[PDB]
Amino acid sequence: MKTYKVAVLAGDGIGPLVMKEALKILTFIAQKYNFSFELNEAKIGGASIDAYGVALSDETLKLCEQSDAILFGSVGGPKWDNLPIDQRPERASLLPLRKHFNLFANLRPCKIYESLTHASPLKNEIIQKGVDILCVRELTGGIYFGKQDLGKESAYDTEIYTKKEIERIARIAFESARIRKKKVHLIDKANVLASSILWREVVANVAKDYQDINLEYMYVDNAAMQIVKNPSIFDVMLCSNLFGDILSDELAAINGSLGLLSSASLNDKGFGLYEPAGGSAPDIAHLNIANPIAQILSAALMLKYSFKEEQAAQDIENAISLALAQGKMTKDLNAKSYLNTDEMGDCILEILKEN
Amino acid sequence: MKTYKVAVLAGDGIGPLVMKEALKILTFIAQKYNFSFELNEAKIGGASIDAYGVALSDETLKLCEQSDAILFGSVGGPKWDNLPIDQRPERASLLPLRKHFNLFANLRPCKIYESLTHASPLKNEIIQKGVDILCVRELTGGIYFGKQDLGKESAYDTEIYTKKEIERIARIAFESARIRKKKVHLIDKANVLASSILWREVVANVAKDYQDINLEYMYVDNAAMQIVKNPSIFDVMLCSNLFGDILSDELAAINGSLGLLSSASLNDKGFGLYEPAGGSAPDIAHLNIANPIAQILSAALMLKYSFKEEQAAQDIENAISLALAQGKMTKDLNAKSYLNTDEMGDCILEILKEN
Numbered sequence: 001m002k003t004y005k006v007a008v009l010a011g012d013g014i015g016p017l018v019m020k021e022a023l024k025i026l027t028f029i030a031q032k033y034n035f036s037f038e039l040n041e042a043k044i045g046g047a048s049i050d051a052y053g054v055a056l057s058d059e060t061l062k063l064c065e066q067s068d069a070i071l072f073g074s075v076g077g078p079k080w081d082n083l084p085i086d087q088r089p090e091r092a093s094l095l096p097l098r099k100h101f102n103l104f105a106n107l108r109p110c111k112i113y114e115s116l117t118h119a120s121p122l123k124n125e126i127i128q129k130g131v132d133i134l135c136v137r138e139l140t141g142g143i144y145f146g147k148q149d150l151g152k153e154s155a156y157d158t159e160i161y162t163k164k165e166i167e168r169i170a171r172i173a174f175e176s177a178r179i180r181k182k183k184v185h186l187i188d189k190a191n192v193l194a195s196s197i198l199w200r201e202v203v204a205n206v207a208k209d210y211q212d213i214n215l216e217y218m219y220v221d222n223a224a225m226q227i228v229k230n231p232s233i234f235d236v237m238l239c240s241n242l243f244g245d246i247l248s249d250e251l252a253a254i255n256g257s258l259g260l261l262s263s264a265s266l267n268d269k270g271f272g273l274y275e276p277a278g279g280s281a282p283d284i285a286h287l288n289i290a291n292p293i294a295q296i297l298s299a300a301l302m303l304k305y306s307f308k309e310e311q312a313a314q315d316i317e318n319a320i321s322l323a324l325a326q327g328k329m330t331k332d333l334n335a336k337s338y339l340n341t342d343e344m345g346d347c348i349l350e351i352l353k354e355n
Numbered sequence: 356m357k358t359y360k361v362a363v364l365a366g367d368g369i370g371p372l373v374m375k376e377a378l379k380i381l382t383f384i385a386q387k388y389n390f391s392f393e394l395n396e397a398k399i400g401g402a403s404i405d406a407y408g409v410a411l412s413d414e415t416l417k418l419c420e421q422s423d424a425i426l427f428g429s430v431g432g433p434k435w436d437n438l439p440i441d442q443r444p445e446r447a448s449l450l451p452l453r454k455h456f457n458l459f460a461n462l463r464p465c466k467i468y469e470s471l472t473h474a475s476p477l478k479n480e481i482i483q484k485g486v487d488i489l490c491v492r493e494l495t496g497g498i499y500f501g502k503q504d505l506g507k508e509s510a511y512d513t514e515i516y517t518k519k520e521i522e523r524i525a526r527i528a529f530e531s532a533r534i535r536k537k538k539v540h541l542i543d544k545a546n547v548l549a550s551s552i553l554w555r556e557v558v559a560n561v562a563k564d565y566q567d568i569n570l571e572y573m574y575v576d577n578a579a580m581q582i583v584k585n586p587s588i589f590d591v592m593l594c595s596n597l598f599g600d601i602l603s604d605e606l607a608a609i610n611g612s613l614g615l616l617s618s619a620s621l622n623d624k625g626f627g628l629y630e631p632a633g634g635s636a637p638d639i640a641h642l643n644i645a646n647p648i649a650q651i652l653s654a655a656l657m658l659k660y661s662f663k664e665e666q667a668a669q670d671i672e673n674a675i676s677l678a679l680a681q682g683k684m685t686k687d688l689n690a691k692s693y694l695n696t697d698e699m700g701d702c703i704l705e706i707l708k709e710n
Binding site: 091121122123126143146148149151152153154157158159160161162163164189192194195197198220221222224225226228229242245247249253254 | 476
């Protein structure tokens with residue numbers, strides 16, 4: 001009986017709330033496909049600062065190194081916002097976990113359920129053409145980490161990429177498109193940036209190994225228009241760290257349902273950190289209304305990309321698809337009639353049992 | 356009788372078509388407020404390549420240096436796309452005119468007429484909160500012009516800004532907000548970029564001279580969400596070259612009516628290049644349906660920012676406001692019933708005479 005070790009870092013605010021549902025779902029589907037989890041809980045972020053004085057402790061970091069994946073909640077809150085900037089929960093948890101496990105690829109899905117057309121800020125006619133996009137963002141390179149300097153009269157940052165960096169994120173994009181609708185858009189600014197011309201060179205060469213995939217190119221400025229005017233053309237969108245950061249946020253916006261958005265941050269060895277894309281939501285941390293679907297979908301991405309448990313993952317995604325299409329939703333999705341956090345989780349679990 | 360010298364560079368495709376209307380409007384309002392134009396036509400872009408072998412000639416550059424403003428159409432087209440990249444009409448016309456007259460400030464309005472709510476890709480409810488935004492983009496600095504290198508295995512570009520660069524674009528933003536709704540958002544990425552931290556420093560210090568103005572800060576990624584979810588909060592948005600480039604395009608997209616969008620590119624001495632924000636539109640260059648309003652609005656911006664003819668400008672903007680609200684529109688605005696390019700111009704001119 002194969003056992004998967006998960007480091008569960010629920011974090012702050014709604015984190016521990018939504019996590020409870022994700023673990024309920026994981027424990028069930030584990031048992032249904034006859035594998036087991038060792039779900040190992042540790043403090044991260046605000047909770048860790050209150051306990052150990054640091055957002056990320058050595059004991060938590062060691063647990064992560066001993067695990068196969070990190071299932072991650074949300075970190076941050078007003079209690080901890082008077083700390084110096086570099087010690088705040090968000091900054092001091094995630095950046096070091098990414099560097100330390102070499103999490104260079106960030107995968108952000110944007111698939112708008114037919115049920116939730118109305119929640120998008122785009123007119124329904126644009127959304128009805130069908131929106132199912134995977135943003136693949138290079139996560140540890142580029143301008144955020146290049147040589148920088150802050151002067152009294154002059155300051156600079158450097159957008160630097162190596163071939164190796166570009167290749168490894170490009171492959172994950174091509175691998176993804178191969179089992180989706182066979183299309184990658186590379187988003188860059190190749191009309192003016194040297195780094196972008198390299199991107200094109202290295203990605204055109206990776207594309208030669210993937211004859212099933214149609215590779216297209218689009219400047220970041222045109223992409224920003226396109227995500228609003230006609231997002232149905234995208235399948236997989238491959239972006240640098242900065243352009244992906246900007247455009248995954250725009251995607252989150254046209255999607256409409258923040259509580260549904262998931263995220264995977266992966267290395268090249270099957271290891272990943274999986275989390276809701278939305279933050280800690282302190283406004284509602286004291287209530288029982290947080291949408292747990294993001295976190296649950298994150299757990300499904302975990303199942304796929306780290307444990308190669310594709311049926312388990314697909315069950316969980318189907319069950320959320322069905323629950324929504326039956327009108328069973330949390331407050332952020334339907335203001336007038338809604339389930340509480342634990343009822344939604346229970347609804348999903350109920351749905352999974354019938355199969 | 357004061358005379359204003361204009362260099363008219365109509366360019367390619369629909370350029371010379373829409374320009375004809377703008378000159379009809381300019382000649383009239385000139386005469387109504389008892390000043391005169393010397394409207395001096397020269398070739399730029401495709402037309403200039405066909406005539407002189409270069410997109411920008413010395414004779415055209417000299418005309419521009421002898422003028423008070425450049426009224427500019429659109430450049431580019433498929434005929435000229437087999438030229439080496441650096442010689443193509445767009446690249447070889449505008450970048451050198453900007454460098455040469457030090458056009459560091461790009462002003463792009465995004466004001467959605469009540470008439471044209473429907474044309475926006477955002478749901479009407481979001482647009483009805485009222486969208487009236489001026490994007491002020493630094494135009495000659497930043498990563499597009501910093502130190503760069505293209506290697507076999509490694510490539511880089513440098514986002515560099517000086518205090519002087521930041522101050523001069525910040526002032527134009529503050530001056531603009533002072534006669535609008537008293538709000539500037541600085542858009543940056545100050546959580547990770549040194550250049551962005553300078554931006555904040557220099558702009559907070561410029562803001563001290565403008566106690567009427569509320570200065571707010573927002574990261575470029577949040578702005579991209581905000582332009583889709585709730586664009587009504589923006590008044591003046593101040594951006595670096597790259598962030599402004601991306602976000603002016605997103606604004607153009609939520610606006611919905613490309614043929615209405617204008618652009619001013621200014622130095623600190625009252626000199627500017629004024630143009631429709633949209634390109635040369637080769638698909639329709641051979642027809643009589645191009646929307647001339649962008650170009651006409653560009654001429655109004657010219658009147659304001661270069662000639663301090665505010666009443667003249669306001670007449671022209673009012674006349675377009677009224678024409679649209681009376682349903683008088685070109686094809687791109689109303690597919691079923693529409694005016695031709697010259698009727699639209701005539702309609703606008705007709706409207707101006709009544710006042």
